[PDB]
Amino acid sequence: GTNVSIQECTTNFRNFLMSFKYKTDEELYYIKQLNEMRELGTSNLNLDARNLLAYKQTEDLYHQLLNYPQEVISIMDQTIKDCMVSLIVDNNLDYDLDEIETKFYKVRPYNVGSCKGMRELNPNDIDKLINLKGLVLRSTPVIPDMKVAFFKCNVCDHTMAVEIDRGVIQEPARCERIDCNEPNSMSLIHNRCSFADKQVIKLQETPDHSISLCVYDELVDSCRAGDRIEVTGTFRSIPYKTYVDVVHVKKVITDQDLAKIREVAAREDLYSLLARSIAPSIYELEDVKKGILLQLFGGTNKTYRGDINILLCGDPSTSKSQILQYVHKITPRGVYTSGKGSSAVGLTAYITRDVDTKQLVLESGALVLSDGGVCCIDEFDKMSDSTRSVLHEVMEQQTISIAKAGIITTLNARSSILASANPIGSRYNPNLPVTENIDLPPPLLSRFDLVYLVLDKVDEKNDRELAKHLTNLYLELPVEFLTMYISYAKEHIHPIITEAAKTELVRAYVGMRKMGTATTRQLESMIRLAEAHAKMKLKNVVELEDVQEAVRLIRSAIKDYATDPKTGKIDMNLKSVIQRKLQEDLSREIMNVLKDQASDSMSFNELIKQINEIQEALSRLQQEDK
Amino acid sequence: LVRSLSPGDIVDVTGIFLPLLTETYLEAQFVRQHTSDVEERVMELITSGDVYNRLAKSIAPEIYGNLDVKKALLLLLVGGVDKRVGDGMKIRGDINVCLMGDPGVAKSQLLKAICKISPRGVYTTGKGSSGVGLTAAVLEGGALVLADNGICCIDEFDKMDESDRTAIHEVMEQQTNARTSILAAANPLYGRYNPRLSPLDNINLPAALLSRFDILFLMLDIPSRDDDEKLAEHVTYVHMHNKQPDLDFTPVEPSKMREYIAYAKTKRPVMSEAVNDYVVQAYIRLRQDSKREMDSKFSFGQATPRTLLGIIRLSQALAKLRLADMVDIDDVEEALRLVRVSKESLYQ
Ligand SMILES: Nc1ncnc2c1ncn2[C@@H]1O[C@H](COP(=O)(O)OP(=O)(O)O)[C@@H](O)[C@H]1O
Ligand SMILES: [Zn+2]
């Protein structure tokens, strides 16, 4: 039989429809919406199906409804019309009822509890209500299907209206007129009938493989290529192909977690803790910790994207593969790629026409699959020139335009790029300029936001610092919180640069400008990194402290202070006479200011701000008893 | 009975074999899948003693006396110890060794021997077979996937295509699964070696892949009357008699060699604080002096954390080879010995 009882279920829902609340949170849910639905000129309701698990009896209905979803929905349609009629004229709150009474309605639950996944379903689970999620790839054009058949008698012109029931066409045998009764006289007119839209949308399903979905009526063309989708429909396989008759589609934590987030947000060692906790296997590298982390935070997206990209110009023995391999896991799911093992087709796509669909179809490459996420490109120095040409438009407009035989179209591949590149030769050569140690053209090398020069020096002292860190780690914040933090930060914070932070950028950029390769590309990093720092701070505006720290980070990443302004070479070491004179001149002025004020002494905090606009110099004076 | 069968399962299935020509099929009815005994042999091995060298001496006695090289094979066959540190970060438990040398020295026989000894060994020559030898095809996995949790032996490594070597680098770095111990053999790029040139100049492979190796022994087919006299006598006796001329030594049979390696595989040695300080002291001592070796431009590679972690894996292997529950200093010194021995071939 049927688990659904016609009168029992409509009574059970009637109690739910008038008594449901979540636990001002105390207000009833649909006591408010019922009036709003009568106001609406819509033809259906997307029912808040998460309410079913939020109430006791509704979950019991769900298990009962698991095998009979159609019957209740059909009953709800009449119930909706009856609810409209009762609220309009029986409650005497409205009088516009004519169109509603004659027409037909539907209801769509959208947040039902998910099932045990696609591949885990069973032959008896066919025709049962399910809930799935996935990504839409392709869409078929509008396909009409028969609903009403129009027959005209070919000898007397009499017309009949015949409607299909359960997919059956019934040909009348004789004309229904009293006089004209010629057998088989009824004829079908193709273009006097009535049709309904049927569309097939292709979904890449990730169970709680790709499944070809199906939609009907107003649900067609509501789903388009690249849409992020959750499915509430019926798993189907009929005499046998696996497909889902989509009933509804969705186009898309505790307060204790908020307390946990705020504790890390409030503590002063926030940046220190993040570096200390992001990569246990990698020792120190404070700036590199700040670098990739700011890539994951990302800037703000306005219409101007925040896709920060980083080049690791380190020596070819520093753990950087140990990072990006680890980055691919910790980050929200992206794609791990190698420049050596990738091609222009491999990154972008292969696009071709389809006979059935009569419009372009795409086979997404590595780069496109990372749309909206993060991708890692190892062996960036070994990428083919044709493939490298793609990145120019990717890192300037996040789009790729193709114009070849029979195909002219543009795509979108908005993504973040993490790039690691060994120096030319077996090791970095500081005796040559930095731009000559990197095997990348200036047009491509300029558009990266951050370039990091990680060098390894043979120092016995620093060797023990690194060695004892690793050697004891393999004897004998968690990733769950870290991902929870990043997802929280990306979700909420959209900082806006303040007036004070804006003006400092001018002096910061001009200073690098007059030292010239300081193109306007690096000015993008002067805002992109600024927003990502405030987002980590969770401050809803970008602070000047974020601005100056990011500028310092760019300076430290490129090592400007250790780079020759003449030929671009790097100092190996990065007591001097200039240190002497500065200390001497500082000491001379301190001896005056300490006594020029109308006191024998003053606080050192005020003294520093008086002259800096020091501790060693005054300590030496104390040693000399001055 | 559904979902009792999965692809790749070696099973015994009972069913009704069912069908003017008639096609046939079977309706399954029942589905099933497919130590003191060896410890006594282990006790005999312990009774004989010299376990570290007996196994190395037992590795292909028909091959000339590359004892220090075959010792690397013993540790590679045993392998290191994996360390999932946490947060998804990984440290490989495999050992990679290269075998460079001139052609005609029959070095490929050791590749056959090691692959034969290992129960999960896959053998490969030159470029991948029809391209599908690497990665997978429309998926049918290649040699590297086939040798998962095993050993892959490659002859003429340098001749592999860029795509062939590209898949090699990912497995050498990520082990995906393609958890493999890589044993490579390659002829000199010029046909014959030139000691006056750097190893990178004499081979097609760059430093990016060679730095991923643990031990990088080089074979030089130097014509010397002294050495060749012993090797010729060694080989000519191998053809005359079905055993090596060193009849005073009784080699361990491959099954027992395999069993002890499997027995060793179960163990897990752990570092002590005494060896912990010794390892960092030896690392610092070797790294600082190795600067001169690279400055002389007459050494295979500079001392980097490849040496620190390489010894750690080798010391773990040596300790696990000795069935030791903890790592000792002599394993570290022996590991340091073999690493330093490998450089000696460049100075012939
Ligand atoms: N600072 C470091 N922290 C941890 N491991 C390191 C460090 N420097 C080198 N290593 C080790 O050296 C090896 C080299 O790997 P890596 O530098 O990531 O890529 P590549 O082998 O291409 O240089 C790795 O196994 C890594 O564990
Ligand atoms: Zn008629």
PDB file of N, CA and C in Angstrom, chain A residues 119-122 277-282 317 321-322 325-326 329 336 338 340-341 379 382 422 427 456-460 463-464 466-468 470-476 479, chain B residues 3 83-91 162 166 169-170 173-174 207-208 211 268 270-271 273 276-277 279-281 283-284 287-288 291 294 302 304-306 308-309 312 316:
ATOM      1  N   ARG A 119      26.168   6.290  -4.855  1.00  0.00           N
ATOM      2  CA  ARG A 119      26.581   4.919  -5.132  1.00  0.00           C
ATOM      3  C   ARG A 119      26.120   3.942  -4.059  1.00  0.00           C
ATOM      4  N   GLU A 120      25.728   4.435  -2.887  1.00  0.00           N
ATOM      5  CA  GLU A 120      25.262   3.567  -1.817  1.00  0.00           C
ATOM      6  C   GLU A 120      23.785   3.217  -1.935  1.00  0.00           C
ATOM      7  N   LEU A 121      23.055   3.845  -2.854  1.00  0.00           N
ATOM      8  CA  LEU A 121      21.645   3.535  -3.022  1.00  0.00           C
ATOM      9  C   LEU A 121      21.470   2.139  -3.617  1.00  0.00           C
ATOM     10  N   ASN A 122      20.240   1.652  -3.555  1.00  0.00           N
ATOM     11  CA  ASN A 122      19.906   0.271  -3.859  1.00  0.00           C
ATOM     12  C   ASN A 122      18.716   0.252  -4.805  1.00  0.00           C
ATOM     13  N   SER A 277      51.572  27.414  13.994  1.00  0.00           N
ATOM     14  CA  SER A 277      50.628  26.308  13.909  1.00  0.00           C
ATOM     15  C   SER A 277      50.303  25.865  12.491  1.00  0.00           C
ATOM     16  N   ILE A 278      50.499  26.724  11.488  1.00  0.00           N
ATOM     17  CA  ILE A 278      50.135  26.357  10.126  1.00  0.00           C
ATOM     18  C   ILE A 278      50.951  25.180   9.615  1.00  0.00           C
ATOM     19  N   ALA A 279      52.269  25.213   9.783  1.00  0.00           N
ATOM     20  CA  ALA A 279      53.103  24.141   9.257  1.00  0.00           C
ATOM     21  C   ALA A 279      54.053  23.622  10.328  1.00  0.00           C
ATOM     22  N   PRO A 280      53.673  22.564  11.048  1.00  0.00           N
ATOM     23  CA  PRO A 280      54.590  22.014  12.060  1.00  0.00           C
ATOM     24  C   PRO A 280      55.874  21.459  11.468  1.00  0.00           C
ATOM     25  N   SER A 281      55.828  20.933  10.243  1.00  0.00           N
ATOM     26  CA  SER A 281      57.019  20.322   9.660  1.00  0.00           C
ATOM     27  C   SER A 281      58.033  21.364   9.209  1.00  0.00           C
ATOM     28  N   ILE A 282      57.578  22.550   8.819  1.00  0.00           N
ATOM     29  CA  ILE A 282      58.452  23.606   8.320  1.00  0.00           C
ATOM     30  C   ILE A 282      58.823  24.506   9.490  1.00  0.00           C
ATOM     31  N   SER A 317      66.619  23.232  -2.485  1.00  0.00           N
ATOM     32  CA  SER A 317      66.662  22.211  -1.446  1.00  0.00           C
ATOM     33  C   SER A 317      65.843  22.584  -0.215  1.00  0.00           C
ATOM     34  N   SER A 321      58.126  22.044  -1.818  1.00  0.00           N
ATOM     35  CA  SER A 321      57.202  20.981  -2.196  1.00  0.00           C
ATOM     36  C   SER A 321      56.516  20.408  -0.965  1.00  0.00           C
ATOM     37  N   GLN A 322      57.244  20.320   0.153  1.00  0.00           N
ATOM     38  CA  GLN A 322      56.638  19.916   1.417  1.00  0.00           C
ATOM     39  C   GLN A 322      55.550  20.887   1.854  1.00  0.00           C
ATOM     40  N   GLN A 325      52.436  20.727  -1.405  1.00  0.00           N
ATOM     41  CA  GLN A 325      51.721  19.464  -1.246  1.00  0.00           C
ATOM     42  C   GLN A 325      50.810  19.516  -0.028  1.00  0.00           C
ATOM     43  N   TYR A 326      51.296  20.105   1.066  1.00  0.00           N
ATOM     44  CA  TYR A 326      50.473  20.262   2.260  1.00  0.00           C
ATOM     45  C   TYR A 326      49.400  21.327   2.061  1.00  0.00           C
ATOM     46  N   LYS A 329      46.104  20.165   0.580  1.00  0.00           N
ATOM     47  CA  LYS A 329      45.205  19.432   1.463  1.00  0.00           C
ATOM     48  C   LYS A 329      44.475  20.359   2.430  1.00  0.00           C
ATOM     49  N   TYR A 336      46.044  20.310  -7.584  1.00  0.00           N
ATOM     50  CA  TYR A 336      47.499  20.271  -7.555  1.00  0.00           C
ATOM     51  C   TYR A 336      48.017  19.992  -8.960  1.00  0.00           C
ATOM     52  N   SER A 338      51.447  20.539 -11.907  1.00  0.00           N
ATOM     53  CA  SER A 338      52.855  20.792 -12.170  1.00  0.00           C
ATOM     54  C   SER A 338      53.000  21.415 -13.549  1.00  0.00           C
ATOM     55  N   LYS A 340      55.527  21.377 -15.528  1.00  0.00           N
ATOM     56  CA  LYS A 340      56.156  20.439 -16.452  1.00  0.00           C
ATOM     57  C   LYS A 340      55.136  19.463 -17.029  1.00  0.00           C
ATOM     58  N   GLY A 341      54.216  18.987 -16.194  1.00  0.00           N
ATOM     59  CA  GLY A 341      53.248  17.996 -16.621  1.00  0.00           C
ATOM     60  C   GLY A 341      51.919  18.571 -17.063  1.00  0.00           C
ATOM     61  N   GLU A 379      56.906  23.452 -10.645  1.00  0.00           N
ATOM     62  CA  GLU A 379      57.707  23.440 -11.869  1.00  0.00           C
ATOM     63  C   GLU A 379      57.313  24.581 -12.800  1.00  0.00           C
ATOM     64  N   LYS A 382      59.371  25.424 -15.740  1.00  0.00           N
ATOM     65  CA  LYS A 382      59.409  24.459 -16.831  1.00  0.00           C
ATOM     66  C   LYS A 382      58.131  24.457 -17.659  1.00  0.00           C
ATOM     67  N   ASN A 422      62.613  26.947  -9.118  1.00  0.00           N
ATOM     68  CA  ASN A 422      64.027  26.865  -8.808  1.00  0.00           C
ATOM     69  C   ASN A 422      64.798  27.931  -9.582  1.00  0.00           C
ATOM     70  N   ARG A 427      71.969  26.112  -8.303  1.00  0.00           N
ATOM     71  CA  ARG A 427      71.737  26.875  -7.084  1.00  0.00           C
ATOM     72  C   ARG A 427      71.626  28.346  -7.454  1.00  0.00           C
ATOM     73  N   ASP A 456      69.379  29.227   1.514  1.00  0.00           N
ATOM     74  CA  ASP A 456      69.946  28.370   2.548  1.00  0.00           C
ATOM     75  C   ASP A 456      71.435  28.666   2.665  1.00  0.00           C
ATOM     76  N   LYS A 457      71.881  28.971   3.878  1.00  0.00           N
ATOM     77  CA  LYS A 457      73.273  29.295   4.156  1.00  0.00           C
ATOM     78  C   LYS A 457      73.877  28.192   5.014  1.00  0.00           C
ATOM     79  N   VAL A 458      75.150  27.885   4.776  1.00  0.00           N
ATOM     80  CA  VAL A 458      75.828  26.836   5.528  1.00  0.00           C
ATOM     81  C   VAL A 458      76.406  27.427   6.812  1.00  0.00           C
ATOM     82  N   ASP A 459      75.579  27.478   7.852  1.00  0.00           N
ATOM     83  CA  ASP A 459      75.967  27.992   9.158  1.00  0.00           C
ATOM     84  C   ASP A 459      75.787  26.880  10.181  1.00  0.00           C
ATOM     85  N   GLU A 460      76.849  26.591  10.937  1.00  0.00           N
ATOM     86  CA  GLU A 460      76.780  25.529  11.937  1.00  0.00           C
ATOM     87  C   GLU A 460      75.742  25.845  13.007  1.00  0.00           C
ATOM     88  N   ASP A 463      72.267  25.375  11.560  1.00  0.00           N
ATOM     89  CA  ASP A 463      72.015  23.965  11.277  1.00  0.00           C
ATOM     90  C   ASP A 463      71.445  23.250  12.494  1.00  0.00           C
ATOM     91  N   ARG A 464      72.021  23.495  13.673  1.00  0.00           N
ATOM     92  CA  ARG A 464      71.519  22.862  14.887  1.00  0.00           C
ATOM     93  C   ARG A 464      70.109  23.335  15.215  1.00  0.00           C
ATOM     94  N   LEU A 466      67.718  24.124  13.091  1.00  0.00           N
ATOM     95  CA  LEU A 466      66.794  23.370  12.251  1.00  0.00           C
ATOM     96  C   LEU A 466      66.848  21.880  12.565  1.00  0.00           C
ATOM     97  N   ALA A 467      68.055  21.340  12.766  1.00  0.00           N
ATOM     98  CA  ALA A 467      68.204  19.895  12.920  1.00  0.00           C
ATOM     99  C   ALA A 467      67.473  19.371  14.148  1.00  0.00           C
ATOM    100  N   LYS A 468      67.688  19.985  15.312  1.00  0.00           N
ATOM    101  CA  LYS A 468      67.032  19.524  16.529  1.00  0.00           C
ATOM    102  C   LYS A 468      65.521  19.698  16.486  1.00  0.00           C
ATOM    103  N   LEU A 470      63.611  19.032  13.710  1.00  0.00           N
ATOM    104  CA  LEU A 470      63.083  17.888  12.973  1.00  0.00           C
ATOM    105  C   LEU A 470      63.391  16.573  13.680  1.00  0.00           C
ATOM    106  N   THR A 471      64.611  16.434  14.209  1.00  0.00           N
ATOM    107  CA  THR A 471      65.067  15.142  14.711  1.00  0.00           C
ATOM    108  C   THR A 471      64.227  14.619  15.870  1.00  0.00           C
ATOM    109  N   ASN A 472      63.628  15.499  16.668  1.00  0.00           N
ATOM    110  CA  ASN A 472      62.779  15.074  17.771  1.00  0.00           C
ATOM    111  C   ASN A 472      61.300  15.039  17.411  1.00  0.00           C
ATOM    112  N   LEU A 473      60.924  15.529  16.229  1.00  0.00           N
ATOM    113  CA  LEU A 473      59.520  15.579  15.846  1.00  0.00           C
ATOM    114  C   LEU A 473      58.977  14.229  15.389  1.00  0.00           C
ATOM    115  N   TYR A 474      59.840  13.316  14.946  1.00  0.00           N
ATOM    116  CA  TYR A 474      59.405  12.025  14.428  1.00  0.00           C
ATOM    117  C   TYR A 474      59.591  10.887  15.424  1.00  0.00           C
ATOM    118  N   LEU A 475      59.656  11.186  16.717  1.00  0.00           N
ATOM    119  CA  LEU A 475      59.760  10.149  17.736  1.00  0.00           C
ATOM    120  C   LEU A 475      58.381   9.536  17.977  1.00  0.00           C
ATOM    121  N   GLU A 476      58.283   8.687  18.998  1.00  0.00           N
ATOM    122  CA  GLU A 476      57.030   8.028  19.369  1.00  0.00           C
ATOM    123  C   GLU A 476      56.448   7.227  18.208  1.00  0.00           C
ATOM    124  N   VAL A 479      43.764  21.422  12.104  1.00  0.00           N
ATOM    125  CA  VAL A 479      43.310  21.766  10.759  1.00  0.00           C
ATOM    126  C   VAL A 479      41.818  22.065  10.746  1.00  0.00           C
TER     127      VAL A 479
ATOM    128  N   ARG B   3      26.764  -7.035  -3.981  1.00  0.00           N
ATOM    129  CA  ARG B   3      27.905  -6.322  -3.415  1.00  0.00           C
ATOM    130  C   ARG B   3      28.828  -7.224  -2.605  1.00  0.00           C
ATOM    131  N   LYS B  83      56.538   8.306   8.418  1.00  0.00           N
ATOM    132  CA  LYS B  83      56.188   9.178   9.539  1.00  0.00           C
ATOM    133  C   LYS B  83      55.126  10.172   9.083  1.00  0.00           C
ATOM    134  N   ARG B  84      53.861   9.834   9.328  1.00  0.00           N
ATOM    135  CA  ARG B  84      52.784  10.808   9.219  1.00  0.00           C
ATOM    136  C   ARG B  84      52.890  11.726  10.431  1.00  0.00           C
ATOM    137  N   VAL B  85      53.424  12.931  10.229  1.00  0.00           N
ATOM    138  CA  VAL B  85      53.679  13.826  11.353  1.00  0.00           C
ATOM    139  C   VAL B  85      52.369  14.353  11.925  1.00  0.00           C
ATOM    140  N   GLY B  86      51.463  14.768  11.063  1.00  0.00           N
ATOM    141  CA  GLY B  86      50.210  15.361  11.486  1.00  0.00           C
ATOM    142  C   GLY B  86      49.786  16.444  10.520  1.00  0.00           C
ATOM    143  N   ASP B  87      48.514  16.831  10.628  1.00  0.00           N
ATOM    144  CA  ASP B  87      47.910  17.848   9.769  1.00  0.00           C
ATOM    145  C   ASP B  87      47.983  17.466   8.293  1.00  0.00           C
ATOM    146  N   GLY B  88      48.120  16.173   8.005  1.00  0.00           N
ATOM    147  CA  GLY B  88      48.259  15.698   6.648  1.00  0.00           C
ATOM    148  C   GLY B  88      49.668  15.720   6.100  1.00  0.00           C
ATOM    149  N   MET B  89      50.632  16.250   6.848  1.00  0.00           N
ATOM    150  CA  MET B  89      52.004  16.307   6.375  1.00  0.00           C
ATOM    151  C   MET B  89      52.632  14.916   6.403  1.00  0.00           C
ATOM    152  N   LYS B  90      53.502  14.660   5.428  1.00  0.00           N
ATOM    153  CA  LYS B  90      53.989  13.312   5.182  1.00  0.00           C
ATOM    154  C   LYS B  90      55.503  13.306   5.034  1.00  0.00           C
ATOM    155  N   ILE B  91      56.114  12.217   5.500  1.00  0.00           N
ATOM    156  CA  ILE B  91      57.517  11.907   5.250  1.00  0.00           C
ATOM    157  C   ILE B  91      57.584  10.485   4.712  1.00  0.00           C
ATOM    158  N   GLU B 162      60.350  13.207 -21.568  1.00  0.00           N
ATOM    159  CA  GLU B 162      59.994  14.229 -20.588  1.00  0.00           C
ATOM    160  C   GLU B 162      58.721  13.860 -19.841  1.00  0.00           C
ATOM    161  N   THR B 166      58.436  13.151 -16.069  1.00  0.00           N
ATOM    162  CA  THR B 166      57.540  14.013 -15.305  1.00  0.00           C
ATOM    163  C   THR B 166      56.717  13.204 -14.311  1.00  0.00           C
ATOM    164  N   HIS B 169      58.880  12.149 -11.305  1.00  0.00           N
ATOM    165  CA  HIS B 169      59.148  13.141 -10.267  1.00  0.00           C
ATOM    166  C   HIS B 169      58.016  13.200  -9.248  1.00  0.00           C
ATOM    167  N   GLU B 170      56.768  13.136  -9.716  1.00  0.00           N
ATOM    168  CA  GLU B 170      55.631  13.178  -8.800  1.00  0.00           C
ATOM    169  C   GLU B 170      55.638  11.981  -7.858  1.00  0.00           C
ATOM    170  N   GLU B 173      58.216  12.233  -5.333  1.00  0.00           N
ATOM    171  CA  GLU B 173      57.930  13.275  -4.354  1.00  0.00           C
ATOM    172  C   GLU B 173      56.664  13.000  -3.548  1.00  0.00           C
ATOM    173  N   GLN B 174      55.635  12.414  -4.169  1.00  0.00           N
ATOM    174  CA  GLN B 174      54.349  12.251  -3.499  1.00  0.00           C
ATOM    175  C   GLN B 174      53.967  10.789  -3.276  1.00  0.00           C
ATOM    176  N   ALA B 207      69.847  18.077 -11.765  1.00  0.00           N
ATOM    177  CA  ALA B 207      70.038  18.007 -10.321  1.00  0.00           C
ATOM    178  C   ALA B 207      68.712  17.935  -9.575  1.00  0.00           C
ATOM    179  N   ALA B 208      67.615  18.344 -10.219  1.00  0.00           N
ATOM    180  CA  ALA B 208      66.319  18.341  -9.547  1.00  0.00           C
ATOM    181  C   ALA B 208      65.868  16.930  -9.198  1.00  0.00           C
ATOM    182  N   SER B 211      68.833  15.004  -6.740  1.00  0.00           N
ATOM    183  CA  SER B 211      68.780  15.418  -5.343  1.00  0.00           C
ATOM    184  C   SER B 211      67.731  14.646  -4.555  1.00  0.00           C
ATOM    185  N   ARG B 268      59.776  -1.385  14.252  1.00  0.00           N
ATOM    186  CA  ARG B 268      59.800   0.074  14.159  1.00  0.00           C
ATOM    187  C   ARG B 268      60.804   0.624  15.163  1.00  0.00           C
ATOM    188  N   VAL B 270      63.109   3.437  17.044  1.00  0.00           N
ATOM    189  CA  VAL B 270      62.864   4.821  17.428  1.00  0.00           C
ATOM    190  C   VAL B 270      64.169   5.432  17.924  1.00  0.00           C
ATOM    191  N   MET B 271      64.358   6.711  17.615  1.00  0.00           N
ATOM    192  CA  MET B 271      65.580   7.405  17.996  1.00  0.00           C
ATOM    193  C   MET B 271      65.625   7.656  19.498  1.00  0.00           C
ATOM    194  N   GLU B 273      67.727  10.018  22.597  1.00  0.00           N
ATOM    195  CA  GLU B 273      68.325  11.344  22.704  1.00  0.00           C
ATOM    196  C   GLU B 273      69.834  11.314  22.507  1.00  0.00           C
ATOM    197  N   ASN B 276      70.252  11.226  18.925  1.00  0.00           N
ATOM    198  CA  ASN B 276      69.683  12.470  18.414  1.00  0.00           C
ATOM    199  C   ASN B 276      70.733  13.573  18.383  1.00  0.00           C
ATOM    200  N   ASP B 277      71.521  13.691  19.452  1.00  0.00           N
ATOM    201  CA  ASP B 277      72.599  14.672  19.466  1.00  0.00           C
ATOM    202  C   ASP B 277      73.729  14.259  18.531  1.00  0.00           C
ATOM    203  N   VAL B 279      73.419  12.621  15.700  1.00  0.00           N
ATOM    204  CA  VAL B 279      73.010  12.846  14.316  1.00  0.00           C
ATOM    205  C   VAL B 279      73.212  14.308  13.930  1.00  0.00           C
ATOM    206  N   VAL B 280      72.798  15.230  14.801  1.00  0.00           N
ATOM    207  CA  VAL B 280      72.951  16.648  14.489  1.00  0.00           C
ATOM    208  C   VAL B 280      74.423  17.050  14.519  1.00  0.00           C
ATOM    209  N   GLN B 281      75.223  16.411  15.377  1.00  0.00           N
ATOM    210  CA  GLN B 281      76.652  16.710  15.410  1.00  0.00           C
ATOM    211  C   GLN B 281      77.338  16.242  14.132  1.00  0.00           C
ATOM    212  N   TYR B 283      75.813  15.717  11.261  1.00  0.00           N
ATOM    213  CA  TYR B 283      75.259  16.523  10.177  1.00  0.00           C
ATOM    214  C   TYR B 283      75.971  17.865  10.071  1.00  0.00           C
ATOM    215  N   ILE B 284      76.122  18.562  11.198  1.00  0.00           N
ATOM    216  CA  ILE B 284      76.793  19.859  11.193  1.00  0.00           C
ATOM    217  C   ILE B 284      78.246  19.702  10.767  1.00  0.00           C
ATOM    218  N   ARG B 287      78.222  18.853   6.982  1.00  0.00           N
ATOM    219  CA  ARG B 287      77.709  19.934   6.145  1.00  0.00           C
ATOM    220  C   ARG B 287      78.729  21.054   5.992  1.00  0.00           C
ATOM    221  N   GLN B 288      79.387  21.435   7.089  1.00  0.00           N
ATOM    222  CA  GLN B 288      80.356  22.524   7.024  1.00  0.00           C
ATOM    223  C   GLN B 288      81.547  22.166   6.146  1.00  0.00           C
ATOM    224  N   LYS B 291      81.089  22.057   2.175  1.00  0.00           N
ATOM    225  CA  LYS B 291      81.176  23.297   1.413  1.00  0.00           C
ATOM    226  C   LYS B 291      82.416  23.298   0.530  1.00  0.00           C
ATOM    227  N   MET B 294      81.836  21.010  -2.617  1.00  0.00           N
ATOM    228  CA  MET B 294      81.127  21.673  -3.707  1.00  0.00           C
ATOM    229  C   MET B 294      81.964  22.796  -4.306  1.00  0.00           C
ATOM    230  N   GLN B 302      76.082  19.057  -2.786  1.00  0.00           N
ATOM    231  CA  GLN B 302      76.302  19.740  -1.522  1.00  0.00           C
ATOM    232  C   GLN B 302      75.489  19.075  -0.414  1.00  0.00           C
ATOM    233  N   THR B 304      72.867  19.049   2.172  1.00  0.00           N
ATOM    234  CA  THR B 304      71.613  19.738   2.439  1.00  0.00           C
ATOM    235  C   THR B 304      70.796  18.839   3.363  1.00  0.00           C
ATOM    236  N   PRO B 305      69.593  19.253   3.830  1.00  0.00           N
ATOM    237  CA  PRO B 305      68.790  18.344   4.665  1.00  0.00           C
ATOM    238  C   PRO B 305      68.492  16.997   4.020  1.00  0.00           C
ATOM    239  N   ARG B 306      68.834  16.834   2.739  1.00  0.00           N
ATOM    240  CA  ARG B 306      68.818  15.506   2.137  1.00  0.00           C
ATOM    241  C   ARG B 306      69.784  14.571   2.855  1.00  0.00           C
ATOM    242  N   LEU B 308      70.774  14.978   6.155  1.00  0.00           N
ATOM    243  CA  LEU B 308      70.242  14.777   7.497  1.00  0.00           C
ATOM    244  C   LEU B 308      69.106  13.763   7.489  1.00  0.00           C
ATOM    245  N   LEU B 309      68.106  13.987   6.634  1.00  0.00           N
ATOM    246  CA  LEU B 309      66.980  13.062   6.564  1.00  0.00           C
ATOM    247  C   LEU B 309      67.369  11.753   5.892  1.00  0.00           C
ATOM    248  N   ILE B 312      68.802   9.649   8.550  1.00  0.00           N
ATOM    249  CA  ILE B 312      67.722   9.247   9.450  1.00  0.00           C
ATOM    250  C   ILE B 312      66.981   8.042   8.887  1.00  0.00           C
ATOM    251  N   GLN B 316      67.265   4.385  10.463  1.00  0.00           N
ATOM    252  CA  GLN B 316      66.055   3.634  10.780  1.00  0.00           C
ATOM    253  C   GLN B 316      66.067   2.277  10.088  1.00  0.00           C
TER     254      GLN B 316
END
